Short mmCIF file of C-alpha atoms (C1' of nucleotides) and ligand atoms in Angstrom, two decimals:
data_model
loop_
_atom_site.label_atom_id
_atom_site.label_comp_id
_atom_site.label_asym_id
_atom_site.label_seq_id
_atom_site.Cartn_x
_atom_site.Cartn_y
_atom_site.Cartn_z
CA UNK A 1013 0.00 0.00 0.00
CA UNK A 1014 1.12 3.76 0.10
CA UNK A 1015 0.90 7.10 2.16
CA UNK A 1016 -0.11 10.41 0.63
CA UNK A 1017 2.79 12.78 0.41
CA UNK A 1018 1.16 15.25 2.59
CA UNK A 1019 -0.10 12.70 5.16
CA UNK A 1020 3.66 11.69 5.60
CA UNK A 1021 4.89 14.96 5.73
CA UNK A 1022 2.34 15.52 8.59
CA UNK A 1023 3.54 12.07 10.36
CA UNK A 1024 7.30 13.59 9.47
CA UNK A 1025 6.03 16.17 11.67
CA UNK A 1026 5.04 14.25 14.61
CA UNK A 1027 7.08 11.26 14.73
CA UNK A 1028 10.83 10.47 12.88
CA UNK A 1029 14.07 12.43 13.46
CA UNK A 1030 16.62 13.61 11.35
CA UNK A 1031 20.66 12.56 12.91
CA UNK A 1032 24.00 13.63 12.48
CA UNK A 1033 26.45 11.15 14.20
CA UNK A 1034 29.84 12.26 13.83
CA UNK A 1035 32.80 10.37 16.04
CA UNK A 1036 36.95 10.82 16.32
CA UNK A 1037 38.17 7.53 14.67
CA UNK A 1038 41.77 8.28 13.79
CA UNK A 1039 44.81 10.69 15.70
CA UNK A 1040 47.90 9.57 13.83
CA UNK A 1041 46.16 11.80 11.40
CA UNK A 1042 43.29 13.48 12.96
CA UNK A 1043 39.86 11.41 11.31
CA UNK A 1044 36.41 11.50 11.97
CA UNK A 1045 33.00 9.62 11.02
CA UNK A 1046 30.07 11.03 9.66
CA UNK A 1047 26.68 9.87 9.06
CA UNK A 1048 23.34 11.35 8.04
CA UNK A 1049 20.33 9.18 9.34
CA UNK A 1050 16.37 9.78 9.72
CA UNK A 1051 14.30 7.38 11.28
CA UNK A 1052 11.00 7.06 12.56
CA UNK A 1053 10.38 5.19 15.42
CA UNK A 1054 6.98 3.20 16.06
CA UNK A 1055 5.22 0.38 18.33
CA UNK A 1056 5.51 -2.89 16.32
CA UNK A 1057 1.66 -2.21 16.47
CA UNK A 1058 2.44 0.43 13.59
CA UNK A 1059 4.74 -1.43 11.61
CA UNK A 1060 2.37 -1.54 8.59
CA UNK A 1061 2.90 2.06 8.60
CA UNK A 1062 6.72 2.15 8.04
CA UNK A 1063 6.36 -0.75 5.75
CA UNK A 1064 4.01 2.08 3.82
CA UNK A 1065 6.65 4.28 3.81
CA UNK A 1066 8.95 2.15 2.95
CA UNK A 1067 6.60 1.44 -0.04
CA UNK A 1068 6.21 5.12 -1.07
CA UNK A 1069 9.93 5.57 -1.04
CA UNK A 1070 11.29 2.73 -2.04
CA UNK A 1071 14.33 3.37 0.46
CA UNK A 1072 15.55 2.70 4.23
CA UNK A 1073 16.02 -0.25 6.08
CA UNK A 1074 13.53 -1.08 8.85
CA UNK A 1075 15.04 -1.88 12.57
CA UNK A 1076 13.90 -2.94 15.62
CA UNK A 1077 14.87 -1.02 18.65
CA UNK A 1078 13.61 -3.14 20.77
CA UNK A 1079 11.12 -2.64 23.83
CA UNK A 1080 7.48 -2.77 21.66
CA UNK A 1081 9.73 -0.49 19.06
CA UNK A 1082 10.12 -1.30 15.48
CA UNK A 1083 12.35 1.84 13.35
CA UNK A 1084 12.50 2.73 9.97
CA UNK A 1085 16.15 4.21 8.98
CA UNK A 1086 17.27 5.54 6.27
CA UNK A 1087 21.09 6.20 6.58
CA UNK A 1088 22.40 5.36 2.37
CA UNK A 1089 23.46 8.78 1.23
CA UNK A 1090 22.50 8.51 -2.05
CA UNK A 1091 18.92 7.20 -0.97
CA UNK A 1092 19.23 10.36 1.25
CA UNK A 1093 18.55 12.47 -2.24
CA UNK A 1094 14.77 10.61 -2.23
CA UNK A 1095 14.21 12.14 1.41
CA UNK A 1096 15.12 15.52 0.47
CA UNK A 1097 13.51 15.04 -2.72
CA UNK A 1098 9.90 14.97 -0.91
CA UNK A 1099 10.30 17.19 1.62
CA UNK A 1100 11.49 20.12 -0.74
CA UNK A 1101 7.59 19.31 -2.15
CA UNK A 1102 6.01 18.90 0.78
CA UNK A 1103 7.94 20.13 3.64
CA UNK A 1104 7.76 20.19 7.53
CA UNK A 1105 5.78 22.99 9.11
CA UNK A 1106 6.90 22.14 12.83
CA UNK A 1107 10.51 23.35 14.47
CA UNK A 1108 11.56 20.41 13.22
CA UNK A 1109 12.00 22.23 9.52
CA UNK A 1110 15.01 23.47 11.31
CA UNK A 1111 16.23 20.47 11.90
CA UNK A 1112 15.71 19.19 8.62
CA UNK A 1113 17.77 21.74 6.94
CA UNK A 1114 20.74 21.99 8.83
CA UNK A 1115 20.17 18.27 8.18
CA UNK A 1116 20.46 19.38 4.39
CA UNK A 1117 23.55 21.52 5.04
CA UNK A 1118 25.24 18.46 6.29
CA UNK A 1119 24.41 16.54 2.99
CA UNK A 1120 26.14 19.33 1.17
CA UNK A 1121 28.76 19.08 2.73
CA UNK A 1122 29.14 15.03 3.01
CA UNK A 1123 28.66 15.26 -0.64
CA UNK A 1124 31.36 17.72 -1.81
CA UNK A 1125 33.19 15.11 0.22
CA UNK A 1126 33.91 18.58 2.25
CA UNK A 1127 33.63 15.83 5.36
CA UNK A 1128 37.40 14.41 4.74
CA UNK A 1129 38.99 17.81 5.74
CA UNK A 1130 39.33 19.18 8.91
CA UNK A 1131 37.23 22.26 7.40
CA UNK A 1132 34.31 19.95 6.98
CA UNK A 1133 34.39 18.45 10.41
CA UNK A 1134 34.50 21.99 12.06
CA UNK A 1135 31.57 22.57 9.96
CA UNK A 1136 29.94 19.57 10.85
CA UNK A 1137 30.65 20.44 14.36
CA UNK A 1138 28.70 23.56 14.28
CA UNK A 1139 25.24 21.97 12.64
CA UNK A 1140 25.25 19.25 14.94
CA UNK A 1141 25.74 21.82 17.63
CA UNK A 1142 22.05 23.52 16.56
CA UNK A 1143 20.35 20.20 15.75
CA UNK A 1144 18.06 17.93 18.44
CA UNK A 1145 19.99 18.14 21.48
CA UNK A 1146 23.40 19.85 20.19
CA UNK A 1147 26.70 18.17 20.41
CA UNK A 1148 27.77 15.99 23.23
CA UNK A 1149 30.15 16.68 25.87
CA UNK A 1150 33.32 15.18 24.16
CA UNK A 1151 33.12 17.20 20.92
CA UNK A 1152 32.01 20.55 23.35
CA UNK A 1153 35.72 20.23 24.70
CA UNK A 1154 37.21 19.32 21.54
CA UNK A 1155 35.62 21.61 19.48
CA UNK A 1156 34.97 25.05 21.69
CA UNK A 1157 34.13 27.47 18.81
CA UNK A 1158 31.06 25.33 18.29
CA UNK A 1159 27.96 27.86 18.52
CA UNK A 1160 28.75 29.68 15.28
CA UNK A 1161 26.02 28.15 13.14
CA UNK A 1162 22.02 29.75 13.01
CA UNK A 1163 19.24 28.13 14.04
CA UNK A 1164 16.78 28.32 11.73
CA UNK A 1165 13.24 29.22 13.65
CA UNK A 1166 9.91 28.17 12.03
CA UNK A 1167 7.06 30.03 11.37
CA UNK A 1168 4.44 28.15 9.28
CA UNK A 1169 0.86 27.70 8.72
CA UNK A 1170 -1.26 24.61 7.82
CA UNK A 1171 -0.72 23.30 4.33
CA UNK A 1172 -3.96 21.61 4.30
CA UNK A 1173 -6.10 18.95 6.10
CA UNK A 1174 -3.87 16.27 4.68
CA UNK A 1175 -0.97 17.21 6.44
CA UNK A 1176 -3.26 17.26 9.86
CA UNK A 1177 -4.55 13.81 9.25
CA UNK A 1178 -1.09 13.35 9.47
CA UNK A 1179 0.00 14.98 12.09
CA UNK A 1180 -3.21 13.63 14.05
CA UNK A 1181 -2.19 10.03 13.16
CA UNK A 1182 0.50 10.88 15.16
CA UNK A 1183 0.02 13.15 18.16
CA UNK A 1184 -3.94 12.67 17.83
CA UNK A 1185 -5.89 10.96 21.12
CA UNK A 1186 -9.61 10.10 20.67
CA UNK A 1187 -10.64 9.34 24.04
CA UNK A 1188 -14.48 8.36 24.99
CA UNK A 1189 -14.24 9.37 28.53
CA UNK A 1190 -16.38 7.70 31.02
CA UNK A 1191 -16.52 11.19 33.39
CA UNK A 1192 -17.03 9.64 37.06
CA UNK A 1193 -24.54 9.61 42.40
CA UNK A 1194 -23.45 12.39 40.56
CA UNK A 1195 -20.62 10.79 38.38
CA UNK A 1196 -21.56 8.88 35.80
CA UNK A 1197 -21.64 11.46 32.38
CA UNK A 1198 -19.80 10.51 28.96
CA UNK A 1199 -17.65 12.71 27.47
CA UNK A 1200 -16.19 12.20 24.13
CA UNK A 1201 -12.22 14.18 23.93
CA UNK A 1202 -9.95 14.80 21.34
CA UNK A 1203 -6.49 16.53 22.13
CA UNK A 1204 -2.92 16.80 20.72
CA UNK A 1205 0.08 17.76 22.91
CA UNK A 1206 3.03 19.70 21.54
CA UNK A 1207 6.26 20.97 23.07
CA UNK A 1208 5.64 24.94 23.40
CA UNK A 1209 8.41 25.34 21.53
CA UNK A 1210 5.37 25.68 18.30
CA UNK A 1211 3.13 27.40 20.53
CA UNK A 1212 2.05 29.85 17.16
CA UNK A 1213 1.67 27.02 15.11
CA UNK A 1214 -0.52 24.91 18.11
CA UNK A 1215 -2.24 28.15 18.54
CA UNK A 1216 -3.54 28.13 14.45
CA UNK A 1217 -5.32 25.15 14.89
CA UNK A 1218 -8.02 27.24 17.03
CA UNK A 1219 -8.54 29.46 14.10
CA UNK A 1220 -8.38 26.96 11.39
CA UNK A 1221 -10.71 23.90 13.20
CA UNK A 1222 -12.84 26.63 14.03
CA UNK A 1223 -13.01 25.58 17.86
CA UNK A 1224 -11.04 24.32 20.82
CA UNK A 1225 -8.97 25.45 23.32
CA UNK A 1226 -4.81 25.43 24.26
CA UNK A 1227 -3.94 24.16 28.06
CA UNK A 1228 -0.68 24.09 28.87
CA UNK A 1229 0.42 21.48 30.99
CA UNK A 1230 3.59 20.90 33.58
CA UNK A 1231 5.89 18.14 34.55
CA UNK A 1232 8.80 18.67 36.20
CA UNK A 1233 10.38 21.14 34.50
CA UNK A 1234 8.68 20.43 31.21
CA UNK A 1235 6.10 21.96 29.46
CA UNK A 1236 3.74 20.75 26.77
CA UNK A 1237 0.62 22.27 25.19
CA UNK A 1238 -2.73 20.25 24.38
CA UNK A 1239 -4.99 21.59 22.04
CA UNK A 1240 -8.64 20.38 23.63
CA UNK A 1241 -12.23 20.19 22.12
CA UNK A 1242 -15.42 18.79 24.38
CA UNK A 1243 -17.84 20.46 22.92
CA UNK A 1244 -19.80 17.95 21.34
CA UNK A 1245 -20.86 20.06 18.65
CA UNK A 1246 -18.40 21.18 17.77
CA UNK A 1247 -17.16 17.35 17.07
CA UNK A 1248 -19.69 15.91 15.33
CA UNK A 1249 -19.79 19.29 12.45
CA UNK A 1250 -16.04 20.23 12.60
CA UNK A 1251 -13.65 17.49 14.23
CA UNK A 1252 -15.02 14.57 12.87
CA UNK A 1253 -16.38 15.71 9.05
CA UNK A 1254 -12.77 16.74 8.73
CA UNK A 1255 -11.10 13.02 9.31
CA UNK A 1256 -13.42 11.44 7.05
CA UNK A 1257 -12.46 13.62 3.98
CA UNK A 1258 -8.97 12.98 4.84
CA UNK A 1259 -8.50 9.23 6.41
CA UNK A 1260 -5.71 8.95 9.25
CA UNK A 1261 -2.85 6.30 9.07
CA UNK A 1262 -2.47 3.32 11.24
CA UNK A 1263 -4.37 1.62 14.06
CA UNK A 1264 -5.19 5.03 15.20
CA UNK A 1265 -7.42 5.23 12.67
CA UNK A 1266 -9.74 2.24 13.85
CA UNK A 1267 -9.81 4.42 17.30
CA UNK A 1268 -11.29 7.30 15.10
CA UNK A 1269 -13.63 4.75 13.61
CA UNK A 1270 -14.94 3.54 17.54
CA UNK A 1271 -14.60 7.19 18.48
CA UNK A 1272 -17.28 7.78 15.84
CA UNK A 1273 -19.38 5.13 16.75
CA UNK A 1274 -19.55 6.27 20.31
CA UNK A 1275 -20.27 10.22 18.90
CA UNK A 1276 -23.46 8.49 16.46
CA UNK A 1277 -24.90 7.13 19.68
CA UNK A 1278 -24.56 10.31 21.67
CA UNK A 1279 -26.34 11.94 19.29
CA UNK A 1280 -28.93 9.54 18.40
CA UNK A 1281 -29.58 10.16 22.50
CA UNK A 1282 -28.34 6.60 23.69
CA UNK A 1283 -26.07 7.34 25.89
CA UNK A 1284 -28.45 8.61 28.73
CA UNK A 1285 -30.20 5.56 28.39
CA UNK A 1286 -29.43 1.69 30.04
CA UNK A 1287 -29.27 -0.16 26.99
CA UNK A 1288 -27.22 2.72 24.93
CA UNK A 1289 -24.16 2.71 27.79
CA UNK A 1290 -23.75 -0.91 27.14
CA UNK A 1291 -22.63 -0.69 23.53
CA UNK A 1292 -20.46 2.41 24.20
CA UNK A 1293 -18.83 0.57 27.65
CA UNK A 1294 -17.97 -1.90 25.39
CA UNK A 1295 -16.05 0.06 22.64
CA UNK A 1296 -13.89 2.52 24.98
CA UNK A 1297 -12.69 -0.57 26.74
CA UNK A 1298 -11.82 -2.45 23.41
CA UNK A 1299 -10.19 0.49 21.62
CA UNK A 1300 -6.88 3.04 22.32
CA UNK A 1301 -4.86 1.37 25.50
CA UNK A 1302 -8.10 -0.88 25.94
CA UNK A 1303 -7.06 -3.07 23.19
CA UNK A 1304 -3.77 -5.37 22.91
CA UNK A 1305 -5.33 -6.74 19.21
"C1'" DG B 389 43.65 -3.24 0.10
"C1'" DG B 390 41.50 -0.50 3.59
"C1'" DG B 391 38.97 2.75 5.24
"C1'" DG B 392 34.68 5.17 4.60
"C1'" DC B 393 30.07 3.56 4.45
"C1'" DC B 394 25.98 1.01 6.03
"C1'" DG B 395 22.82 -2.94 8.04
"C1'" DG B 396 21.24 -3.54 12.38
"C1'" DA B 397 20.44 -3.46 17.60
"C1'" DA B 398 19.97 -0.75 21.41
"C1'" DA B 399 20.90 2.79 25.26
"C1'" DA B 400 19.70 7.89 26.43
"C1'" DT B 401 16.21 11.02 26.92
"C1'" DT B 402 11.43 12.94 26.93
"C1'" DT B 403 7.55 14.36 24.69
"C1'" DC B 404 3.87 12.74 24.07
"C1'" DT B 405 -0.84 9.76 24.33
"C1'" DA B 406 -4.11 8.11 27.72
"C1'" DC B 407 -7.55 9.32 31.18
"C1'" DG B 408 -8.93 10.81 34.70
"C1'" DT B 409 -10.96 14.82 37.92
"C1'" DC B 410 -12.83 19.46 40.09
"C1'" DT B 411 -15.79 22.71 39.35
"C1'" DG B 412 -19.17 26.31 37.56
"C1'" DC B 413 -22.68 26.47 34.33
"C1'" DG B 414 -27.57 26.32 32.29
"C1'" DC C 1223 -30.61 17.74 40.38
"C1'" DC C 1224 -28.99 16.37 35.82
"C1'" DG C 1225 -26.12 16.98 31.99
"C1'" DC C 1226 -22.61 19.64 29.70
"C1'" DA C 1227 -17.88 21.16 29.55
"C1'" DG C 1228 -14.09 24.72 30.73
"C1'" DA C 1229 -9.77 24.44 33.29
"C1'" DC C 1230 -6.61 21.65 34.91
"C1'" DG C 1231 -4.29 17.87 36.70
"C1'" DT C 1232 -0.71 12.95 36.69
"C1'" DA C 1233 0.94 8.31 34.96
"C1'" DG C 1234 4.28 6.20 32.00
"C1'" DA C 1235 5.36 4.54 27.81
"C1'" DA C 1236 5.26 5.16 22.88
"C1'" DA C 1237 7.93 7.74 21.23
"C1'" DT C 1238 12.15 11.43 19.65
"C1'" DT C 1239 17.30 11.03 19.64
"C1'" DT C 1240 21.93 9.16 20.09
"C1'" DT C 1241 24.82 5.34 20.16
"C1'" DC C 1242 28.46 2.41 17.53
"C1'" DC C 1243 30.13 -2.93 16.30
"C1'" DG C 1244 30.81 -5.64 12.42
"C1'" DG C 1245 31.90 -5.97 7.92
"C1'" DC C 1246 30.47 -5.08 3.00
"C1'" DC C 1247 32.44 -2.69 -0.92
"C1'" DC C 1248 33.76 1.32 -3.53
CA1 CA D 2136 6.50 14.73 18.03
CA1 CA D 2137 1.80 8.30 17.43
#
DNA sequence: GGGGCCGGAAAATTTCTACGTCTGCG
DNA sequence: CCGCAGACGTAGAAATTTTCCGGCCC
């Protein structure tokens, strides 16, 4: 099977990274390794998915990381031009554009074979420095003038609903919560969490679904947004019409499916009743983390 | 030949997904 | 009072990254 372009771009967006591992290897003369990599890293529940992608691409070797985690990596340079090659048609919107072309930067360099001089590694050095988490603690001492290089910031808008069934595939939750003599209500919920770090882009999606609200939300000394929407409403005529034009990816997408069965019988009044609850108690606790199957 | 390149597993780190609740409201 | 839902919590694991041996192969 195969994955829109934009839908992928959208998953791009949520899940997969983009690495630069570079490594001292030599001293008699001074040599160093370099390698580009991106890889997207799923639940062997998902595998279909990177076996989609890997069918749309036609590159990248699939791994498995072990603990419930399959990983699709793509690390052959020149199957590194097919990467590039979509997401220079369809690129990121996220921070993670930034990423992505410092990512490019280092191709350019890796392919001028730039890479075998010490004027490639220092320049290595200094993208690797901006990228993810920045360099480790070895090359910060052996490479000090190592916070020359910009970070590219992102400000984007939505492409288009393809790229959010995407990026929903990914981040998305569909959660038929079972609020609880005076506890016993249904609520339907669908949220996405975000690092703040694309707080303007997070904030868009109020503007462009038409409804929800932003929460921000604490742990430790982390910080996440969740873009929220109860309102039933506002679910049935905006969330959900929206998925259905543009299907999601994955088993995620059979959670949408019980999600909407849940959101027919709310409607259709069944959930205030004794026979109605039954059907609905029986899809939230066979779909999301209620099903192994 | 030999050294950069690459299949593949896996540790490091955290940003998610999942799912409640308290509370005011009409 | 019942039902809706805004605002706001915590668990913990599916994720985001980084790691590098062995050994093809240009
Ligand atoms: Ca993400
Ligand atoms: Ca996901």
């Amino acid at each position: 099977e195969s994955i829109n372009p934009w839908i992928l771009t959208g998953f791009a967006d949520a899940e997969g990274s983009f690495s630069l591992y570079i490594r001292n290897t030599n001293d008699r003369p001074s040599r160093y390794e370099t390698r580009l990599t991106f890889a997207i890293g799923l639940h062997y529940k998902d595998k279909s998915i990177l076996e989609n992608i890997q069918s749309t691409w036609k590159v990248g070797i699939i791994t498995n990381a072990g603990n419930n985690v399959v990983q699709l990596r793509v690390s052959r340079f020149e199957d590194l031009k097919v990467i590039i090659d979509h997401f220079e048609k369809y690129p990121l919107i996220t921070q993670k554009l930034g990423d992505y072309k410092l990512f490019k930067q280092a191709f350019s360099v890796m392919e001028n074979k730039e890479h075998l001089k010490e004027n490639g590694i220092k320049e290595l050095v200094r993208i690797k420095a901006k990228m993810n988490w920045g360099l480790n603690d070895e090359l910060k001492k052996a490479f000090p003038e190592n916070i020359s290089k910009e970070r590219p910031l992102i400000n984007k808008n939505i492409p288009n609903l393809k790229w959010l069934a995407g990026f929903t595939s990914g981040e998305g939750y569909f959660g038929v919560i079972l609020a609880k003599a005076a506890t016993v209500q249904v609520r339907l919920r669908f949220e996405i969490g975000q690092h703040i770090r694309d707080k303007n882009l997070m904030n868009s999606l109020i503007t462009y679904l038409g409804c929800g609200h932003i929460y921000e939300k604490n742990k430790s000394g982390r910080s996440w947004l969740v873009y929220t929407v109860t309102k039933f409403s506002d679910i049935s005529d905006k969330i959900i019409p929206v998925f259905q034009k543009n299907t999601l990816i994955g088993v995620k997408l059979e959670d949408f499916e019980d999600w909407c069965k849940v959101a027919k019988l709310i409607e259709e009044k069944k959930h205030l009743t004794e026979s109605g609850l039954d059907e609905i108690k029986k899809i939230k606790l066979n779909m999301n983390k209620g099903r192994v199957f």
